[PDB]
Amino acid sequence: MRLDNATWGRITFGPVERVRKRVLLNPLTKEMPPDEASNVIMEILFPKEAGIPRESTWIHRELIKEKREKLKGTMITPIVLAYMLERELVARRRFLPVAGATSAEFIEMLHCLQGENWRQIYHPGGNKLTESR
Amino acid sequence: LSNAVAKMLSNCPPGGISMTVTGDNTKWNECLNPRIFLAMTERITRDSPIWFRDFCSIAPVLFSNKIARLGKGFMITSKTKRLKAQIPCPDLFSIP
């Protein structure tokens, strides 16, 4: 969706400083720590074995209700479903060379945005955040 | 490394010389004794409790008294007879 709806600009050849900095690789639905996301996942797929509830049980109640209603009719294995949640909840942060764009929806396209001797203008689709602006 | 280079570069005295030794060690594994590694842990755990000091001290104590097994052995042959046979590690000295 972020590639199809997107639009491209001008290629431009010329030197580019690219700085090495930790960045989010893929944009998440709602960011959480490893335990919090896991506890949320547990509530979505395996409610009986979840164990002791935490505060996080209450905090994301809307997300759990949404995801349990969304992932209701599917026949696909739980272990797969839990993997796909983990991607759209737990954060993938690693070091990359960047210049101009830090946002995850750009970081995923980084390879086509900038090289050591060139620049490419890119406009991703969907919606963009207000704080990011 | 890139940031640590810039600092240790521009730190040098003006009107002086800064030289980079492109370095590498030899026999790295064969020279470092386990008893040094034992003495290292003790000084690192100085403040930590006596059980943990003893816990950390075991792995270097093992490596200090380790025994190395000698692979498969040695295959001996006769080209005239066209025969082969592995002499195993215990039978290394069961033959002239």
Binding site: - | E42, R43, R46, F52, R53, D54
Partner: protein
């Protein structure tokens, strides 16, 4: 000691389940016999309530034949099993799960039950545990001097209420009979350290694994920890 008293009075079902509960909390049964006794009583109080009560197919309580008790014992079982059962009930019956671990659950009432053991007053212990639970579990407090403070809609019937109070004081009388009541009343708490010490063989390996000019590991430990090498 209390160790001998629990062997004679209590069953092996209660002896093991208590010790297993102390193992999960990382506490030693032998170092704290009085602390085991609390859970030994607390677990036996729960069993006495459940042992007689059963439900029939129509959905009404009776006294015992059918393979479905009116109560469900949560205390005694391991944490991960108990919390599975606690959730399994609340999710099926359609109620919000308690934040703390409950002791019993009544199938006809569809409510959790929390049991407490107290030496002094029952009403004092009742309103103390009301602050934690609020109105999550229906409290059933009992004490050794025949003083009890139950919940507003208490499921504990008058027939069992006697049997509960019978064993309570009958135990307390048997404790003071061999001067065992003095140990429970006195203070008992020991600080749980991390258990790791070396054996005979490994120590001897550590003694030979020493630098040149050292008698043993004691000599190496002192050297590193004391002397200054500078220069």
């Amino acid at each position: 000691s209390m160790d001998t008293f629990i062997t004679r009075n209590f069953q092996t079902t209660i002896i093991q389940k208590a010790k297993n509960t102390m193992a999960e909390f990382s506490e030693d049964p032998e170092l704290q016999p009085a602390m085991l006794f609390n859970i030994c009583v607390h677990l036996e109080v729960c069993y006495v309530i459940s042992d007689m009560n059963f439900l029939d197919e129509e959905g009404k309580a009776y006294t015992a034949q059918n393979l479905r008790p009116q109560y469900e014992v949560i205390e005694g079982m391991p944490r991960t099993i108990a919390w599975m059962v606690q959730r399994s009930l609340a999710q099926e019956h359609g109620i919000e799960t308690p934040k703390y671990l409950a002791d019993l659950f009544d199938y006809k009432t569809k409510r959790f039950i929390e049991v407490g053991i107290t030496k002094g007053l029952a009403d004092d212990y009742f309103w103390k545990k009301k602050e934690k639970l609020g109105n999550s579990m229906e409290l059933m407090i009992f004490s050794y001097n025949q003083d009890y403070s139950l919940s507003n809609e208490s499921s504990l019937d008058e027939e069992g209420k006697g049997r509960v109070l019978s064993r309570l004081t009958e135990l307390q009388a048997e404790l003071s009979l061999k001067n065992l009541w003095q140990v429970l009343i006195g203070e008992e708490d020991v600080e749980k350290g991390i258990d790791f010490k070396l054996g005979q063989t490994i120590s001897r390996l550590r003694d030979i694994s020493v630098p040149a000019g050292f008698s043993n590991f004691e000599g190496m430990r002192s050297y590193i920890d004391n002397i200054d090498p500078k220069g």
